[PDB]
Design an enzyme around this catalytic site. Structure first.
Site, PDB file in Angstrom:
ATOM      1  N   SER A 145       0.858  -1.198   0.000  1.00  0.00           N
ATOM      2  CA  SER A 145       0.000   0.000   0.000  1.00  0.00           C
ATOM      3  C   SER A 145       0.888   1.240   0.000  1.00  0.00           C
ATOM      4  O   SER A 145       1.741   1.353  -0.897  1.00  0.00           O
ATOM      5  CB  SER A 145      -1.071  -0.098   1.086  1.00  0.00           C
ATOM      6  OG  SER A 145      -2.093   0.861   0.858  1.00  0.00           O
ATOM      7  N   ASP A 241      -7.977  -2.806  -7.726  1.00  0.00           N
ATOM      8  CA  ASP A 241      -7.545  -2.548  -6.356  1.00  0.00           C
ATOM      9  C   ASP A 241      -8.600  -1.759  -5.573  1.00  0.00           C
ATOM     10  O   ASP A 241      -9.126  -0.747  -6.055  1.00  0.00           O
ATOM     11  CB  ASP A 241      -6.222  -1.790  -6.391  1.00  0.00           C
ATOM     12  CG  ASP A 241      -5.673  -1.513  -5.015  1.00  0.00           C
ATOM     13  OD1 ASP A 241      -4.901  -2.348  -4.500  1.00  0.00           O
ATOM     14  OD2 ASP A 241      -5.997  -0.441  -4.450  1.00  0.00           O
ATOM     15  N   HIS A 290      -6.928  -5.827  -1.850  1.00  0.00           N
ATOM     16  CA  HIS A 290      -5.906  -4.820  -1.554  1.00  0.00           C
ATOM     17  C   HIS A 290      -4.869  -5.436  -0.623  1.00  0.00           C
ATOM     18  O   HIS A 290      -5.229  -5.973   0.430  1.00  0.00           O
ATOM     19  CB  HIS A 290      -6.532  -3.564  -0.910  1.00  0.00           C
ATOM     20  CG  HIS A 290      -5.565  -2.433  -0.694  1.00  0.00           C
ATOM     21  ND1 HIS A 290      -4.883  -1.830  -1.731  1.00  0.00           N
ATOM     22  CD2 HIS A 290      -5.174  -1.793   0.434  1.00  0.00           C
ATOM     23  CE1 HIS A 290      -4.108  -0.872  -1.252  1.00  0.00           C
ATOM     24  NE2 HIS A 290      -4.272  -0.823   0.060  1.00  0.00           N
TER      25      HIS A 290
END
Ligand SMILES: Cn1sc(=O)n(Cc2ccccc2)c1=O
Ligand SMILES: *[C@@H]1O[C@H](CO)[C@@H](O)[C@H](O)[C@H]1NC(C)=O
Length: 344
Positions: A145, A241, A290
């Site tokens: 991330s 995503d 994610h």
């Protein structure tokens, strides 16, 4: 378990001025080192950072950190959970700078918060050299991330740092998970521009020279910064995503998706796939999710019959095409969960 060490240079700090740090588990028989950058969004002005300090304080301060953390996924030391690098020296670097790992600014009479992400990475590397990193053959800088974007922003600086310190034999590489975003139109960039000014954020040199003053925000987008990098980087990105869709204002409710949103979602996957066409080390499944690399079940997903731990092993072999050992794995089917191995 990985054990906490607070930085010996206490001028390198989290947002509130407390010392930054890292969690370490050494492996005496290994010359491989994995340094993982945690994620967790960011903050970009006084009011937004004050709110984050009320309810996400561990992402802004070390005062309440625990003494140990369990390694999971690519940070696990068990071969059943981590077929790729189970015997490596393992490092987890907590994200406490709220700056996508880009900042170089101290707390002072003019700054309520310190934004030091780029300096935290450099200081961790420096202090690890006395704990065995000096004997490494490979340093893999990984992240998820905001930490995946942080890999793209910092991998070449780590390589330059080790060269200038007299360690040219250590091979520096990157693994960026879920940090490859599109500056697209919403279904229904300014915050990064604001953040860079607030953080005194820094970007890689060649990318900075292309885009020039006032346009450094462009270097936070993977497809723009990646071609400028010299270190080998493996890119992991879900085609649909969830963080990308959230900022695009897309929310799936289970009702029939109508034509406008169907076309929007299909075009997003096609654009992501296009940006990866010339990325030779990549893993991009057609799923709505994610993050992946520190999840315990990261071994389960496959593209064209190849798992992510296998693809990373094939990448290692390629850096010594390979029969039956691919490194570029991008799904071509056009809707989330068209790949049967997607996370449930
Ligand atoms: C699609 N998304 S998601 C997100 O968070 N942002 C802002 C951002 C961009 C690059 C790096 C960090 C943050 C996007 O453009
Ligand atoms: C401590 O970190 C600061 C900020 O990066 C740096 O300016 C200083 O030289 C460091 N001191 C030592 C002794 O490493």
């Amino acid at each position: 378990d990985l054990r906490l060490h607070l930085l010996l240079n206490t001028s390198v700090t989290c947002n509130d001025g407390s010392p930054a740090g890292y969690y370490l588990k050494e492996s005496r028989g290994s010359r491989r080192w994995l340094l993982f950058l945690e994620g967790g969004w960011y903050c970009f002005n006084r009011e937004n950072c004050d709110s984050r300090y009320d309810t996400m304080r561990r992402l802004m301060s070390s005062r309440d950190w625990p003494r140990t953390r369990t390694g999971t996924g690519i940070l696990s030391s068990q071969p059943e959970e981590n077929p790729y690098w189970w015997n490596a020296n393992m490092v987890f670097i907590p994200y406490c700078s709220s700056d996508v790992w880009s900042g170089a600014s101290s707390k002072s009479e003019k700054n309520e918060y310190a934004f030091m992400g780029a300096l935290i990475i450099q200081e961790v590397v420096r202090e690890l050299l006395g704990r065995g990193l000096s004997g490494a053959k490979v340093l893999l800088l990984a992240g998820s991330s905001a930490g995946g974007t942080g890999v793209l922003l910092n991998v070449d600086r780590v390589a330059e740092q080790l060269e200038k310190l007299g360690y040219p034999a250590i091979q520096v590489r990157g693994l960026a998970d879920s940090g490859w975003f599109l500056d697209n139109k919403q279904y229904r960039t300014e915050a990064i521009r604001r953040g860079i000014r607030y953080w005194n954020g820094v970007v890689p040199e060649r990318c900075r020279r292309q885009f020039q003053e006032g346009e450094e925000w462009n270097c936070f987008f993977g497809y723009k910064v990646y071609p400028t990098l010299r270190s080998p980087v493996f890119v992991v990105q879900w085609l649909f995503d969830e963080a990308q869709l959230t900022v695009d204002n897309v929310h799936l409710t289970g009702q029939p998706v109508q034509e406008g949103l169907r076309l929007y979602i299909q075009n997003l996957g096609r654009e992501l796939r296009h940006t990866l066409k010339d990325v030779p080390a990549s893993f991009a499944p057609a799923c709505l999710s994610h993050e992946i690399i520190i999840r315990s079940h990261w071994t389960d997903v496959q593209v064209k019959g190849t798992s992510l731990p296998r693809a990373l092993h094939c990448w290692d072999r390629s850096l010594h095409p390979l029969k039956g050992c691919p490194v570029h794995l991008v799904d071509s089917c056009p809707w989330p969960h068209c790949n049967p191995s997607c996370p449930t």
